[PDB]
Amino acid sequence: SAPGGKSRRRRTAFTSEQLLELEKEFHCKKYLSLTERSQIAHALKLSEVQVKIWFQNRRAKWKRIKAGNVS
Numbered sequence: 874s875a876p877g878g879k880s881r882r883r884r885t886a887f888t889s890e891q892l893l894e895l896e897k898e899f900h901c902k903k904y905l906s907l908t909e910r911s912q913i914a915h916a917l918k919l920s921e922v923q924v925k926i927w928f929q930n931r932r933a934k935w936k937r938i939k940a941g942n943v944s
Contacts, residue, residue: 878937884926891917895927 887895894913898905914921 880933880937885923887919887923887927891919895919 894916898909898913902909910924911921913919914924
């Protein structure tokens with residue numbers, strides 16, 4: 874059963890199916906250089922423009938849980 878979590882701005886036209894590889898690289902390495910980012914982008918059908926903003930999502934995960942503030 875999926876964990877849900879109703880916060881998601883739809884800002885792209887990718888699918889879980891094209892995303893598989895795009896997440897799979899996190900199991901190879903923690904970082905995707907320009908040459909490396911252009912592999913998956915050219916591996917399926919994706920747009921290196923969108924890849925720029927795809928990284929704007931890579932902070933939400935722990936902030937969902939670590940929803941908290943500073944003095």
